[PDB]
Amino acid sequence: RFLKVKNWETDVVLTDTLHLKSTLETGCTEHICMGSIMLPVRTKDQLFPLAKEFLDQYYSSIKRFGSKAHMDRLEEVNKEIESTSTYQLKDTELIYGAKHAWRNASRCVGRIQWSKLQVFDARDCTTAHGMFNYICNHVKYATNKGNLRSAITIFPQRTDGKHDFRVWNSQLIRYAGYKQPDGSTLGDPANVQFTEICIQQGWKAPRGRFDVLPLLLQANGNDPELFQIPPELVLEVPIRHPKFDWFKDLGLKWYGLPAVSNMLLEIGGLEFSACPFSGWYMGTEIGVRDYCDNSRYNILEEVAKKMDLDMRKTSSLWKDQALVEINIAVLYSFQSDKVTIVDHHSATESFIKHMENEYRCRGGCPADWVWIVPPMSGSITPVFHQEMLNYRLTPSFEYQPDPWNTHVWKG
Amino acid sequence: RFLKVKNWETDVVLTDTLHLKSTLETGCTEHICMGSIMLPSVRTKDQLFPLAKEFLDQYYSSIKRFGSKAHMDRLEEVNKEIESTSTYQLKDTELIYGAKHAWRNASRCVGRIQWSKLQVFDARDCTTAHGMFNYICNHVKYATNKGNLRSAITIFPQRTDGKHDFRVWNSQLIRYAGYKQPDGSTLGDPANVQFTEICIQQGWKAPRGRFDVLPLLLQANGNDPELFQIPPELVLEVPIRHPKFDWFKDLGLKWYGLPAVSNMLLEIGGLEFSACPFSGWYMGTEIGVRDYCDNSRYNILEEVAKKMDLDMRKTSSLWKDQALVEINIAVLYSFQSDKVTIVDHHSATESFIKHMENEYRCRGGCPADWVWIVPPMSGSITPVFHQEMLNYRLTPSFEYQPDPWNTHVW
Numbered sequence: 001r002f003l004k005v006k007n008w009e010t011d012v013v014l015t016d017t018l019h020l021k022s023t024l025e026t027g028c029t030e031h032i033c034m035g036s037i038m039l040p041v042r043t044k045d046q047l048f049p050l051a052k053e054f055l056d057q058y059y060s061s062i063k064r065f066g067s068k069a070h071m072d073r074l075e076e077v078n079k080e081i082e083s084t085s086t087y088q089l090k091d092t093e094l095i096y097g098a099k100h101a102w103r104n105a106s107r108c109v110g111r112i113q114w115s116k117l118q119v120f121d122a123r124d125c126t127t128a129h130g131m132f133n134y135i136c137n138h139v140k141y142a143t144n145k146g147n148l149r150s151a152i153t154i155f156p157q158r159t160d161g162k163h164d165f166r167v168w169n170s171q172l173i174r175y176a177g178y179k180q181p182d183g184s185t186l187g188d189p190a191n192v193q194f195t196e197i198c199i200q201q202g203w204k205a206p207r208g209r210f211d212v213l214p215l216l217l218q219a220n221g222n223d224p225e226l227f228q229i230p231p232e233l234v235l236e237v238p239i240r241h242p243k244f245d246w247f248k249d250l251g252l253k254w255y256g257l258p259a260v261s262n263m264l265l266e267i268g269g270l271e272f273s274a275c276p277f278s279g280w281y282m283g284t285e286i287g288v289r290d291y292c293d294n295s296r297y298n299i300l301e302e303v304a305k306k307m308d309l310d311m312r313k314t315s316s317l318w319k320d321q322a323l324v325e326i327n328i329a330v331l332y333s334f335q336s337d338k339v340t341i342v343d344h345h346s347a348t349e350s351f352i353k354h355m356e357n358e359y360r361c362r363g364g365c366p367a368d369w370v371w372i373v374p375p376m377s378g379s380i381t382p383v384f385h386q387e388m389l390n391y392r393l394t395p396s397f398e399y400q401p402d403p404w405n406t407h408v409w410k411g
Numbered sequence: 412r413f414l415k416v417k418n419w420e421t422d423v424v425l426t427d428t429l430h431l432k433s434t435l436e437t438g439c440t441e442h443i444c445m446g447s448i449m450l451p452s453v454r455t456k457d458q459l460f461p462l463a464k465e466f467l468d469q470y471y472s473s474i475k476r477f478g479s480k481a482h483m484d485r486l487e488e489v490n491k492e493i494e495s496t497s498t499y500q501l502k503d504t505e506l507i508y509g510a511k512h513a514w515r516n517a518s519r520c521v522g523r524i525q526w527s528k529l530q531v532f533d534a535r536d537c538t539t540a541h542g543m544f545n546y547i548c549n550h551v552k553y554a555t556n557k558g559n560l561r562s563a564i565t566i567f568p569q570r571t572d573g574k575h576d577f578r579v580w581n582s583q584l585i586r587y588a589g590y591k592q593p594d595g596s597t598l599g600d601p602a603n604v605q606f607t608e609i610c611i612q613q614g615w616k617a618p619r620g621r622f623d624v625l626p627l628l629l630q631a632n633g634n635d636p637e638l639f640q641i642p643p644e645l646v647l648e649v650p651i652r653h654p655k656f657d658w659f660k661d662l663g664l665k666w667y668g669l670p671a672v673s674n675m676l677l678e679i680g681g682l683e684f685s686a687c688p689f690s691g692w693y694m695g696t697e698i699g700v701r702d703y704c705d706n707s708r709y710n711i712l713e714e715v716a717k718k719m720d721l722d723m724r725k726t727s728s729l730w731k732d733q734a735l736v737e738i739n740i741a742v743l744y745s746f747q748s749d750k751v752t753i754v755d756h757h758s759a760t761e762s763f764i765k766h767m768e769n770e771y772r773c774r775g776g777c778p779a780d781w782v783w784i785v786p787p788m789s790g791s792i793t794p795v796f797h798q799e800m801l802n803y804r805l806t807p808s809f810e811y812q813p814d815p816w817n818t819h820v821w
């Protein structure tokens with residue numbers, strides 16, 4: 001069953017056959033679409049089917065499907081599952097798996113880079129202090145004095161679900177957020193709950209607007225522990241605007257390394273509950289979402305004010321005009337400081353090229369239009385007119401609930 | 412099955428039960444979502460009466476006469492008519508309810524807060540294209556209302572056996588012509604190049620300008636279509652200037668005030684109305700974002716940025732975004748200056764959230780298509796962006812139908 005998608009700006013039509021290899025359900029039923037819904041414990045019983053599927057996929061990619069090395073590996077994985085209930089990936093399989101988890105991430109516009117992921121095997125790690133050391137080295141490697149490099153660090157896999165490794169932070173590098181008694185928020189409103197958890201665990205909060213949060217790290221199902229990332233490893237960029245000299249006086253800055261750490265990596269039925277991964281920012285992620293979203297820093301007002309815009313009626317498009325300016329500032333500051341960033345025009349262009357190539361050589365590219373389209377200027381980017389098919393392929397990155405909602409506390 | 416949608420900007424959560432009434436299918440499956448595909452959209456006495464029953468059931472419930480005197484009488488009365496005529500006719504009251512609820516169910520429409528204020532013109536007594544033309548001119552004049560725009564629909568006779576279809580071949584009642592060039596690309600409007608050819612190739616005398624209002628191509632009772640020029644005095648147009656940039660009027664841009672879609676199919680109680688032009692008023696971005704800046708369209712961003720002396724050497728300077736905002740500021744400014752109704756995307760999306768609020772409270776749900784509701788600029792600073800939505804097809808409904816020239820047995 002072949003399916004077509006059309007690019008309504010170029011009349012380019014592509015044929016998807018890769019969705020046939022889809023297994024996991026999407027959330028949409030025959031009579032309802034949940035395409036805009038944000039978020040729509042494992043035994044030996046179902047594991048070897050998942051292991052076999054992954055291993056078949058793996059050996060196909062190395063052109064050894066049905067070879068002796070392939071059959072022996074299936075045999076080997078079979079025996080380790082029946083006697084030990086789980087199994088261990090080889091280094092070759094872990095790297096393939098983590099790369100393809102990114103390749104399958106249908107909400108990720110930066111996937112042209114998927115094959116250049118640097119995979120750090122941290123499966124020998126046993127303690128929170130060891131996690132801290134592995135994460136420090138990830139940050140240093142990935143930052144690279146501003147010449148960012150994609151990397152993932154993979155901590156031991158779930159076993160009985162009672163000894164999970166978890167990074168409790170949602171990203172390795174994030175700014176604290178403090179609810180004030182008067183209802184206002186100091187710093188990043190997105191992190192107020194996590195900040196309070198950190199303070200409750202004994203973090204001495206400087207209580208500033210741009211405080212790097214501590215790491216809160218759980219090894220082998222134990223209670224989490226706090227660690228301060230060495231400040232010389234946290235690369236930050238002061239935000240200034242090329243034409244407006246008053247923009248620096250807003251005193252804004254942002255960190256250079258986007259590194260997401262709350263997600264789960266699934267490979268061959270194995271769940272890696274601790275797997276921080278990092279890339280480089282698309283400019284709108286900082287400029288549009290992190291600063292202007294009503295539930296974030298909310299600087300549109302002050303920017304529009306200092307720009308002297310008609311703020312009385314929204315039909316002056318003062319909000320639109322301030323947002324563009326803030327996003328020019330973000331791009332200008334990172335480029336000026338020689339820290340890798342990509343504008344939403346370059347990144348969406350690259351993704352169309354990626355997507356067409358994936359249809360050419362893979363037969364499909366799962367894509368979530370609701371997420372791929374940038375949050376500003378959507379229709380003047382080439383992905384807006386591009387039809388996309390969303391479906392779930394494994395290996396995959398999955399959501400998992402926040403650990404503090406599930407963790408059984410030791411003390 | 413009793414699903415919930417969250418707004419991630421306010422944490423408001425709404426429960427949807429209306430989706431359980433969803434009749435038609437969405438084109439998604441459990442293994443694959445098609446929420447971004449543009450178009451996944453000869454009846455019989457068998458399928459017809461249940462469709463009629465379901466419509467009349469929700470109609471008589473709406474007037475709180477469910478299970479009553481008139482309800483049962485109408486049900487058998489229509490049941491008698493279908494068995495005897497292989498179709499049936501809608502009472503005026505049901506026809507109005509049917510049309511208002513097709514708008515209400517249009518899950519891609521951000522302006523549905525106005526759904527109940529639709530003016531319905533019953534043109535089912537129409538028999539000829541000239542008659543069609545008279546009805547359309549009156550529609551245009553009523554809806555334009557000297558710039559004080561009023562929502563309206565005009566409903567021509569329903570399909571009978573598919574050989575007697577009434578069709579408006581134009582995609583909109585009012586649209587600028589598009590002429591391909593022997594040398595470069597396109598002059599006029601590229602969206603309408605084919606239709607502009609089919610007009611000339613049908614008889615039209617094109618002034619081959621940049622803003623030539625297309626004639627109407629009207630087909631009655633399945634006959635060959637006829638050309639008609641809309642009287643110029645009824646086409647209200649807004650010349651586009653900018654409140655800061657004197658050179659902006661030098662671009663020689665204008666746009667018409669009335670958005671009036673004429674190629675969709677209205678389905679009520681199983682009856683198909685293949686000609687049902689409907690109109691409201693524009694959202695600002697529909698003119699300045701889509702109609703003026705797409706590579707598929709006018710693509711004037713090139714020259715606006717030049718006239719702003721922006722750094723077009725690299726995309727990372729965001730000159731397209733800068734020019735894009737200025738174009739849409741001008742469009743709003745121009746329409747408002749001339750007192751022609753228009754809404755900005757901040758106001759229309761905030762209105763829509765309140766509408767969603769009302770539909771979940773007083774109806775249990777509101778089918779919504781995020782891909783189409785979120786405006787094509789500044790998406791995440793409008794409140795629809797953080798609003799989870801549920802997309803499902805309810806009837807009565809507006810539906811896509813094939814372009815007639817590929818279908819009409821000429």
Ligand code: HEM
Pocket residue numbers: 102105107108109110111113117150151152277278279280281282285342347371397
């Ligand atoms: C290197 C440059 C990269 C860029 C510019 C980039 C950009 C983005 C953006 C803009 C989003 C949408 C999220 C939002 O805007 O709120 C996204 C989603 C995502 N990215 Fe990438 N990304 C990059 C690399 C990576 C890497 C290295 C990984 C993993 C190894 C990754 C995995 C994902 C996943 C899993 C999602 C969606 C998560 C979900 O389902 O909610 N990305 N990316």
Ligand code: HEM
Pocket residue numbers: 513514517519520521522523525529562563564689690691692693694697701754759783809
């Ligand atoms: C009164 C002011 C109205 C406004 C501001 C408005 C706004 C919009 C917008 C922004 C879209 C998306 C199209 C695009 O952006 O390219 C849309 C689509 C649509 N509108 Fe509304 N609209 C209005 C009136 C009406 C009326 C009176 C009807 C019918 C009675 C209607 C039915 C529809 C339908 C059926 C669609 C989508 C068709 C499809 O499924 O593709 N609208 N409208």
Ligand SMILES: Cc1cc(N)nc2cc(-c3ccc(OCc4cccnc4)c(CN)c3)ccc12
Pocket residue numbers: 038258259260277278279280281282285419
């Ligand atoms: C490697 C990488 C690079 C980059 N440059 N960018 C990235 C963005 C995400 C990402 C994933 C999910 C997200 O969503 C979280 C969420 C879920 C539910 C409710 N709220 C928020 C967000 C933020 N939107 C970002 C993940 C990885 C990214």
Ligand SMILES: Cc1cc(N)nc2cc(-c3ccc(OCc4cccnc4)c(CN)c3)ccc12
Pocket residue numbers: 449450670671672689690691692693694697
């Ligand atoms: C009454 C009304 C008022 C308004 N203010 N606005 C409206 C916009 C549309 C509309 C419907 C479908 C559309 O889609 C065109 C299309 C579909 C499939 C293939 N090619 C092209 C578009 C343009 N995007 C607009 C329809 C009605 C509108």
Ligand SMILES: C[C@H](O)[C@H](O)[C@H]1CNc2nc(N)[nH]c(=O)c2N1
Pocket residue numbers: 008384385386387388446447448449782783784785786787
């Ligand atoms: C690919 C996508 O489905 C298509 O281009 C849609 C996207 N969203 C849209 N949204 C609106 N309002 N109008 C449109 O024409 C479109 N086009």
Ligand SMILES: C[C@H](O)[C@H](O)[C@H]1CNc2nc(N)[nH]c(=O)c2N1
Pocket residue numbers: 035036037038370371372373375419796797798799800
């Ligand atoms: C409800 C809606 O799905 C939600 O707000 C999504 C929409 N698209 C998005 N797209 C990106 N890139 N990032 C986001 O956080 C979101 N949020």
Ligand SMILES: [Zn+2]
Pocket residue numbers: 028032033034035439443444445446
């Ligand atoms: Zn779907």
